[PDB]
Amino acid sequence: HMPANHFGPIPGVPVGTMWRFRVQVSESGVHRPHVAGIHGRSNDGAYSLVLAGGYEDDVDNGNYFTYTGSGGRDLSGNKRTAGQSSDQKLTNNNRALALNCHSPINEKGAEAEDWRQGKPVRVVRNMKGGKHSKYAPAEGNRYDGIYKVVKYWPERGKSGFLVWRYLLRRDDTEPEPWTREGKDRTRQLGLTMQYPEGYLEALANK
DNA sequence: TGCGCTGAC
DNA sequence: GTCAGCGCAATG
């Protein structure tokens, strides 16, 4: 098993792989947290993240995307999601993603000096991101490859509350699964949606 | 809309 | 131990 702090691609899991549920993506090692959008360690960096349309400030343009940090929410009442209700902070997961940027951690945001030297982040796109993105898969989760953090900065989001934003750019030798070349690669690799054992059965009989 | 669960600390 | 949390096959 790859360690939890493994940076980079997971051996045996090619770009284009698909899983129906987040828990499955977690077991693959691609994105360990089954809920959180970012998997990171505040004093190391972020190993992966998921675009699932959970934050209104996310902007997905394929090879480039602006990701939103987590937090700035009031999850009281034993919740896991809510609208913005407070300013986000460059701590925990947000500090982790910032560390991937090839530049000294800056409390006011920073820009990378040769973004390609930054730490790699595995990116997964979820179907729920399809309401505001033409790159999200129609179903489940899809591993889209390695991206790097070009820069990050704070600014008020659509809600009026401060949010941390990150510009990610793809840096992977395998083709993007959404392009013509990528769909051919997926076909060539024979990749198909991974469902839990007995899921389809419980779906049909249902 | 709240629960069981997992990773970070 | 405590807390964060881009889930969800659930439930009204």
UniProtKB/Swiss-Prot annotation:
Sites of the Glycyl lysine isopeptide (Lys-Gly) (interchain with G-Cter in SUMO2) crosslink: 134
Knockout mutant characteristics: Mice display a sensitization to DNA damage and replication block, and die in mid-gestation.
Residue positions where N6-acetyllysine is found in the record: 134
Marked site positions, Required to discriminate between hemimethylated DNA versus symmetrically methylated DNA: 78
Residues at the site labelled Required for affinity and specificity for 5-mCpG sequence: 80
Site (Required to confer preferential recognition of cytosine over thymine): 68
Residues that hold DNA according to the record: 52-53, 58
Domain YDG, chain residue ranges per copy: 8-170
Phosphoserine PTM positions: 103
Chain positions covered by the region annotation Required for formation of a 5-methylcytosine-binding pocket: 55-58, 67-70
Region (Required to promote base flipping): 34-35
Signal peptide stretch: none
Tissue: Expressed in thymus, testis, spleen and lung. Within testis, expressed in almost all cells except elongated spermatids.
The record's account of how the chain is modified after translation: Ubiquitinated; which leads to proteasomal degradation. Autoubiquitinated; interaction with USP7 leads to deubiquitination and prevents degradation. Polyubiquitination may be stimulated by DNA damage.
Subcellular location: Nucleus
Induction, per UniProt: Up-regulated in proliferating cells, and down-regulated in quiescent or differentiated cells. Early induced by E1A in postmitotic cells. Down-regulated by aphidicolin.
UniProt free text on domains: The tudor-like regions specifically recognize and bind histone H3 unmethylated at 'Arg-2' (H3R2me0), while the PHD-type zinc finger specifically recognizes and binds histone H3 trimethylated at 'Lys-9' (H3K9me3). The tudor-like regions simultaneously recognizes H3K9me3 through a conserved aromatic cage in the first tudor-like subdomain and unmodified H3K4 (H3K4me0) within a groove between the tandem subdomains. The YDG domain (also named SRA domain) specifically recognizes and binds hemimethylated DNA at replication forks (DNA that is only methylated on the mother strand of replicating DNA). The YDG domain contains a binding pocket that accommodates the 5-methylcytosine that is flipped out of the duplex DNA. 2 specialized loops reach through the resulting gap in the DNA from both the major and the minor grooves to read the other 3 bases of the CpG duplex.
Task of the protein: Multidomain protein that acts as a key epigenetic regulator by bridging DNA methylation and chromatin modification. Specifically recognizes and binds hemimethylated DNA at replication forks via its YDG domain and recruits DNMT1 methyltransferase to ensure faithful propagation of the DNA methylation patterns through DNA replication.
Assembly information from the UniProt record: Interacts with DNMT3A and DNMT3B. Interacts with DNMT1; the interaction is direct. Interacts with USP7; leading to its deubiquitination. Interacts with HDAC1, but not with HDAC2. Interacts with BLTP3A. Interacts with PML. Interacts with EHMT2. Binds hemimethylated CpG containing oligonucleotides. Interacts with PRAMEL7. Interacts with ZNF263; recruited to the SIX3 promoter along with other proteins involved in chromatin modification and transcriptional corepression where it contributes to transcriptional repression. Interacts with UHRF2. Interacts with FANCD2.
Protein name: E3 ubiquitin-protein ligase UHRF1
Organism: Mus musculus
